[PDB]
Design an enzyme around this catalytic site. Structure first.
Site, PDB file in Angstrom:
ATOM      1  N   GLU A  11      42.087  27.961  38.282  1.00 55.14           N
ATOM      2  CA  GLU A  11      42.948  28.911  37.573  1.00 55.14           C
ATOM      3  C   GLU A  11      42.499  29.330  36.176  1.00 55.14           C
ATOM      4  OE1 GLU A  11      45.781  29.082  40.820  1.00 55.14           O
ATOM      5  OE2 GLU A  11      45.428  30.343  39.056  1.00 55.14           O
ATOM      6  N   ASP A  20      46.544  40.285  35.410  1.00 52.25           N
ATOM      7  CA  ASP A  20      45.475  40.097  36.382  1.00 52.25           C
ATOM      8  C   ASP A  20      45.197  41.336  37.228  1.00 52.25           C
ATOM      9  OD1 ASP A  20      47.415  40.128  38.481  1.00 52.25           O
ATOM     10  OD2 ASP A  20      47.614  37.943  38.390  1.00 52.25           O
TER      11      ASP A  20
END
Ligand code: CL
Ligand code: CL
Length: 158
Positions: A11, A20
């Site tokens: 992550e 994102d």
């Protein structure tokens, strides 16, 4: 190695809210969510008006909360719990990793793979796991997770 170090690798770590590729606002170690809505969720989670910027310690506490949520999600799910219980420590981490990424419902949908893991048919599990939209969407990560399920070792993360 443990689930914390594994997910940190998968992550990454961001200390400022970021959007994102799929359009979600994210921060910390994979803590995903309008921007105002995102900051509101974050402030409630952290416990202060962050204005989108947090400390490393706050990111780790959030990460710890999110990992706990994934583990509890597995234990509260009728399809996932038995599989998790049957697995060794390393493969359990791979299952938590999947839940952390896609949610309980998503992982519970991997019927063939779950049945193969429960039966310790590691290669059969790996074959089925790769034949998924999950795999095709985030393949580098999926390959690491699948190799972990296949071998029961941390090889893909070292
Ligand atoms: Cl499956
Ligand atoms: Cl699918």
């Amino acid at each position: 190695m443990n689930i914390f170090e594994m997910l940190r690798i998968d992550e990454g770590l961001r200390l400022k809210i970021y959007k994102d590729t799929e359009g979600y606002y994210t921060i910390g170690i994979g803590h995903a969510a309008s921007l105002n809505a995102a900051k509101s969720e974050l402030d409630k989670a952290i416990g202060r008006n962050t204005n989108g910027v947090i400390t490393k310690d706050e990111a780790e506490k959030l990460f710890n909360q999110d990992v706990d949520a994934a583990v509890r999600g597995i234990l509260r799910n009728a399809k996932l719990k038995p599989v998790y219980d049957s697995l060794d420590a390393v493969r359990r981490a791979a299952l938590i990793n999947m839940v952390f990424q896609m949610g309980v419902t998503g992982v519970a949908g991997f019927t063939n793979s779950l049945r193969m893991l429960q039966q310790k048919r590691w290669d059969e599990a790996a074959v089925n796991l790769a034949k998924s939209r999950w795999y095709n969407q985030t393949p580098n990560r999926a390959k690491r997770v699948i190799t972990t399920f296949r071998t029961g070792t941390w090889d893909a993360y070292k």
